[PDB]
DNA sequence: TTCCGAGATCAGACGAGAT
DNA sequence: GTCTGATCTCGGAA
């Protein structure tokens, strides 16, 4: 609201509630995706495609 | 290139008024009243002679 | 191709026309963020019959009239249609049955050619009989006799009169009863995109979405036919200051400069009091900005008082079609202090912004103030500082989209696999619950009314 | 006081635009090839020390070409443009070494000095900038790079006050960066050869000054903060008992990956030492002095490397590769021109391959500058001249130090919003010079160094220390006498005009810069409040009885760079002269470039609307040169009837833009019409387009060459295959003409054959066909040999396009617009005198963009045509509105230009008046025939079996992953399967149930048992993922399931 | 096969596998003569 | 019996999705159509007449289901 | 450029075109005017189903 | 038509056809065929005493007489200079008669302009008799 | 040196003194003309030095 | 006595699309 | 050419 840019709270009530539902606040970075998702190709389609595919073969 | 033979807006025949215009500017005639001598009343047919450049005498040099 | 929200892909029915351009209605151009300045946009053609229905129902323009951030309508009038329908619903216009049946009968092609179009009875009878402008705008909302639309709307407008509900002579207060415009003129805020009380949003919620798309495709056909025969046009007479501005701007530039000469002199020659923020030479500039923004807004108010009605940039600013009252003060009266990232322009040389001024000059017109408006033309130092402040607009759009493109990517690569399941819970792909009801009430933000409430009960009861 | 603008057309005849490219190359030919021989004489070998090869001189002759043994004929530059050669001259007892390409209008090119009558027989346009080499047929410019200065003490803010001098070795072999860091309050001297951030007092004791009393006396005698140098380091030096000079070389002698007396010469290089290190110590001490007393983007720091400075970086390296291979030969055959003539390949194919592929790949200087050259954009005239004055970077925001040197509004937008600049009009990049008389006047005027006590150069006010080019040259007690005496001397002419003395009083360093590469500019000297021009001088220049260079020696015009502009009080006009004016300003419209400056009234628009035009001015579609018909270039756009603009500026006459214009000027009438002009769109009429308003001429170019192979067979151009009659194929060989090459003056449909190039494998014909979409007429067909004589043949395809719906017009103010509708003429609002408009412009482009400069062109144009006059709207001046408006009244028009029209459709008069007049609308090169595209089902790429990328390869446009989320957010599931598997990669694969892996066709090779194998349906790109995952050791073992 | 010189403009009947030099010149830019067929144009 | 008795926009899309593709493979038409050749335009005539031989299988995410006839739903 | 971010998610697509846009207010909000030359190239496989038999024959 | 240099040819046959002007503008029989309503200018107040010659130079030259009389209104181009005067703008209303216009046909020279107009009326009559015979069929 | 279409377009804009309503429209494509529909002109200019 | 905090060095990434 | 969490080495203490 500081930048104009009105938005529903129900969008932010979802983004916050995703971001903090597994114990701790999991920021949406490359690193927070590993602690949010279990499936590999969803992580592998995101950043670090090399390590996420080898580590899930290990 | 060469003089467009029409006005773009109205379409007065203006292609036959180039060497008659250049013959006027060879004399004393000022740029303004030269086009009043050729019967160019409105300005849209006046810019077809005034704003025109004649590249065709210059390209011909480089076209043996 | 820079798809930034859900509305950048939209389905469309396809009519084979005679040209090589993709031509669409200009109401749907702000969802695409598409101007016609040489922009290109792609056209996919779904092959299976299942993917044809998923385009038509889910992604049709008649379905996605409303952005899912706010609930505001994005498909609504832009530019000329707004300044067409404002000039038509303005209080002064009167049409005789010559022009009235001509403007009205523009709305009779393409699913509209089979209606007995009912001209309303005229609002002047005896001395001459003639219609009013707003009575012809009611034909947009209800052209036939057997049309079931009864639109209702009561709202404020731009240049609102402040006092008086609907009876003051400024006439910026819309009241539609049963799809008949009873008072007021159609601003941007009653026709354009971004307001939750324009008619195309009101026709959407109360009367289905086919009547909102029809009444929007009626206005796009009607309002240019009025405007091209009324001739709205801008000129340099619409930018020249009158006599009253010049004697107002001359004193404001003098009395605004006497004090800033003293406020500079009260700092260095002697003792200057300090604002609580910082020391001297920091609150001096914040007290410079107060007196210079006094100048550009009093001269901006000196301009707007003398600026005669039916002025073309004024008319484009009253209805919010293009450009606010800031741009008229910049063009005519005086464009204010050119600010670089929230301050006066920084000294690129030693203690001096440009080598024309003196060293350590904190003077106005030496650190970024431009005194001439765009009519009287900027001077070389003034043109440079306006360029310096102008490039910070251009530079920041290059770097923001370099970041918010990434921030769009990280956001959607985590948040994509959520959907509100059938028992109202919102779960992840792995079954784990994020929310127990979506957002506490289980309500669409898209269908949500203003104030984050699905109804706004004052409007429904009066409807 | 009245007329001083005349200095600018006299400056442009000498060294102003595209003459800084030329002089820089003319310096490189006539000086720099004779300063590389002095560096690289005496080719000696060790296997025989009794011979010697010694170069005397290099001459670089006139451009020639041989086609046989000894014809050695000369060449015009517009023959190398046709025969795809490279315009070059030989490099030279008195025997050739190689060949080096020559930029046009250089001192050894053909085109200099010759009249326009002689430009015809050389087939070259006289209004053509020059400054571009012709390499392998295409014409390349070396773009001006901007680098930071050399040996500059820059005080940055990495963590706290780190300073690093990026010294560049005058012996150019290396460039080192001896930065100085602060860690936990202690100074260090980090380098890239040092394995450790060593404390600075370790260096100082290694540098010969052993005692600690001397070091503080160097840094700060006045203690107040330089006492806090004390317990930082000289205690930290003393905390380990290490007071010794030889022992403190020893700590350097370990970490440097007695032996360091030499290796301290590769640290802070350009401070010179003859093993008298006293000069080196003060320069390190001044580097520490800055930190304790403590702008990377400021144009006194940015030096510009031109095309001739940049080729000398190459040719010195290519001479060395030619030089060292003479040693490799003389050490091969001794246990000499005849083993050298095959190294004519070395320079010639070294120099040319560096310009065509824009790569200085120089391992000898460790630099890999990519994209230094660019092919010239011959779209219009000014798109050629806008490339000659172009600066590429290596920040984005506009600094005010670019005032007068660079154009503020000429920039691209996108990746390079402030990184690709453009030179202004009245600028001049400097060249190098000798430093002899600079030092010789410095040591007379008063300076002293290496005998002064460490303490002197300190907080005491009278210690301004002179710095030349980054090397300290003594200290002067009185800065004013030195700055003033050098300045009087330079004006008198004893010192070179370009050298600049500037003074920074924050740190007492005066700065004599003779660098070469500094952005410079001239100003009119203001001694007392009366200027120096005196008008009568502006009259001498009128008859020519004097030249701009006579102003310099008469001390009337001074060249000022950016650094000297810190010390001046530049007055903009005559009437703003003050008590302390110093220099004045020649003509203030020269701060705009050559792409802006084209704009009339740029000082009335919002400034981000001039910048839009500087992109679109280069994109304009107009005439190119007087030789535009003999050029065969890959894409040449020509206007049918160009017109010079009605509202010219003053920069248009100096460029002679009106001699070869771009765009007509149509009578617009800004009004809202028919609602097909909403988002910047604009309505044209279908009579002006029938009368020839902006007919296009798009000229493509197709070519082929017929090479003789190593097999000694060759290519044939056998004629048409007449079938059942003399008539050629169904349409395929219809235009061939029986000599092979198609006939000039004939139309080519799609898939019609231009030449029958047939190739030996025995002959498989490779027919060069014209694809297009629409038809094209052959205009010329040229036949020649290239350098390796192989019969090249070049076509030239006319195509005229009347501008229909889609074709982008701009408006000379950045208000571009696709032509949305083309109405007939009789449906259009004629005024009283009969003039129906050409281009109805929407009036909503004005109040948000605030381009008031457009609204005056409809006034200055309309008064202009009615009087028979071209109204100057320049920048910061030109014809004012209060005199234009009283010229409409004499011809019976409205004094604002708003003319009473009556509507064309309804016949009644319009309710409001309509603004009306001629403004210069330039068509630009975005026509929808080049961009209409659809792909039903065509070629797929060979690797991933997706549709290809490009319209030239029948397209398919990427439904990107951002548009994937849009299709996700709609919830359309069956669309995405259809849009990303069905109609992109519809593949079919076979896997097996057990051991689940890709097995081909009916059975899987692993576990041959053939029973479990069950086909899947998958995208091919996912199958290619599995099969390249399984190639490395990751094995996606699919476990299928039946559809439930 | 008849070709026209670079600037000499003399019709030079060359044949195949022949250098493209010219009678009365040495210049190797040889354009081709215009076609002989009736080419129909539209005045639109 | 516990989910929403309103036909969602994702159920109207797929019911029109597959009833279009069924009727484009010569399915028996239920609406005695009046010259519509687009199979999708037939399917919206099927929906408004409420004659579509389709039952929506609504999956509660635990695994249990709940059927819903397209006759038995409230379209918009 | 790799197969994940550009060949598996953002993959090129058949039956798809691209031109320059120009306005047309005389259409309903739901309709795009498609050029003839594009509409003769982009094709829809319409199966023959007793109601478009005479239409597809025509 | 074009310019040449020696050794250059132009050889071409032409075909002329009868074309409507709306097909292409090269078929247009008239340079400009505009019209304008005849103005009539009424001085509401009598003007005299050097304000008359002020009002003389304000209008078009031939339009006025000098007291002030509006001698011949047909020659008035609508500069609208009165509103710059700030004194006479309240004095005189300027107006144009609605049912009295002034045509101005200037032919290119194909047909003489008195036969262009009598052909122009003749094809409007033919355009409505083309439709009146459509109703006679139906 | 004048391009072919631009010549052929500039031959289009030249008015022709033969009055219409002696002739009729061109019915079919009919590029041969029928001397009741068309009116042919010839232009043969070849310049030399005097 | 060991262990956990705080000093260095190391990663993969840094928007669409278009000619 | 930085912005980044991770993961390694040092060090002072109950
Ligand atoms: Mg755009
Ligand atoms: Zn005209
Ligand atoms: Zn197997
Ligand atoms: Zn010859």
Coordinates of C-alpha atoms and ligand atoms in Angstrom, one line a residue, chain E residues 5-10 12 22-27, ligand 4:
Chain E
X5 CA 31.7 -3.2 -67.7
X6 CA 32.2 -1.5 -64.4
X7 CA 32.6 2.0 -65.9
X8 CA 33.6 1.3 -69.5
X9 CA 30.1 0.1 -70.4
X10 CA 31.3 -1.9 -73.3
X12 CA 31.9 -7.9 -73.6
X22 CA 37.1 -6.4 -69.9
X23 CA 37.9 -5.1 -73.3
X24 CA 39.5 -1.6 -72.9
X25 CA 39.6 -2.1 -69.1
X26 CA 40.8 -4.4 -66.5
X27 CA 37.9 -3.9 -64.2
Ligands
LIG4 ZN1 35.6 -1.8 -69.0

